[PDB]
Write a protein that binds this ligand. Structure first.
Ligand SMILES: [Ca+2]
Lengths: 106, 106, 106, 106, 106, 106
């Protein structure tokens, strides 16, 4: 399985496990956080990341096979889907992340 | 069953599952959120969505069959009903949502 | 069992179940909400409803028989009681509510 | 047993059970509330209330017999005690309370 | 066993049970409270007390025998200890507390 | 088993267990705290420590053997690693910490 690590933001170093399928990252200010509590405590498929400026929500999708990883950047009324590589910094809005095999520490 | 997906707001991407019968969405600023905690932690039939402008509460009704979905936009002392289709954006106040089957991600 | 539905306020559409005996609704601004957390998480007999203007605290009494429903507005150092009809809008200060049987959606 | 009812404030109508022995009421602004969560969820013996001005904490002691009720107002490094009666408004700081038998609503 | 009673602060009159061994009191503003939730819900060996100014964290140590009581005031990278007597106001920073036997009400 | 004790900050005195493997400490202001709630309630591998100035996120890795302890400071786009000792004050940015065997109180 794969892990998303933050390489910047006040949560730099935080590591989030990804489930097979879709994981949502909500990225933004106060208004989003306190409301994100709306989602149940089910095995976490959405996470909130605080960022004061330039935050863009995104999903990561890990195919059932774990052979392709797709990042869906969620813009106004549309999304931009990109193929992404492991163990490399990936910029999403003003956030910088890395996706690593669980067994390969960064 | 069906899932309500936000297509704008700070929570763009967030997905809320619908139960048979009735689910309420409270859409608005700070005053509503902190108070929405008043409702018990029972299987979630009301959700809060932050929106800084143009938020209008609405409830979705799904029949026992799960073949018809009606949205009721809640105005002052009254409501306005509309039939909805799956997989199509729906504008309620300034919020844009889409209703999808669980099995067809969007 | 009866349900109180809000017909206005930022919480328009919210529905609160009524227990036999007494249910209190505290209606007002920010100061009341954050402090209403003082009351335990026991089966809910008190609710907070935000209203920027004209909010009047009230309690509702359901007799053991469920044949009469009494509403008390909690004014300064006094209260004003009245019988209320089911399935009809009821104004309390500037809040508008409706009490319905759990079996009759509005 | 007995019930403490608030007869004024934004929280007019709130009812709290008095326990056998000693019950403490913490009265004041935001700073006290969020911190009152420090106390465990044991059968409630301290309770918080909000009051914008003149909030004085107080404790009520009830004898084994339930015939005497002593209220202690908690001032700086000292307390001022008085015997109180049932079903009679009692002023404590800016707050007006009333202590009633459970079986006798106000 | 022994109880810590607050003799000032917004929580004046609050009484915290002490366990044999070391109990931590974190005393300060908002930043500490919300983060104190980090500590597990194990039998409470930690308490948060709100104080807007002059708050100092401290530990109370009750030897296994319950014959000596030591307060450790926490400073930068070090602590300063003193023996404390029962039933007398103890100043820690701007907080005022009193340690009593459970059987001797203050 | 090893324990991290804070020797400064508003949480001076708080202690955090270290798990075998990796533990992250997020050290900063308000924005990080409220959002750190994003991480699940799984056996705690990240913790948040408030510090108004000079906070540096850092992670500690305890080898499977429990014979070496390595602390990594998480700077901008990079990390800095060093061996650290038990039972001695360790400066990490402006935080002061100490790591002890659980069996040896401090
Ligand atoms: Ca007596």
């Amino acid at each position: 399985p794969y892990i998303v690590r933050l390489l910047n933001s006040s949560l730099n170093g935080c590591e989030f496990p990804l489930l097979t399928g879709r994981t949502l990252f909500v990225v933004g200010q106060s208004d989003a956080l306190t409301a994100s509590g709306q989602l149940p405590d089910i095995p976490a498929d959405s996470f909130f990341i605080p960022l004061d400026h330039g935050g863009v929500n995104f999903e990561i999708q890990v195919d059932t096979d774990a052979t392709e990883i797709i990042l869906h950047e969620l813009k106004e009324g549309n999304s931009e889907s990109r193929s992404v590589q492991l163990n490399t910094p990936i910029q999403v809005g003003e956030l910088l992340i890395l996706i690593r095999p669980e067994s390969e520490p960064w």
